[PDB]
Every structure is written in structure tokens, then in C-alpha cells.
């Protein structure tokens, strides 16, 4: 996961 909040 790598789903950054931006």
C-alpha cells in the first residue's frame, strides 16, 4: 500500500 492522503 502506498496511497498517500494528498
Known amino acids: 500500500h502506498r496511497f ?3
Do not use: Q
Request: hydrophobic residues 35%; positive net charge; charged residues 35%.
Open 4 to 6: 498517500l492522503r494528498h
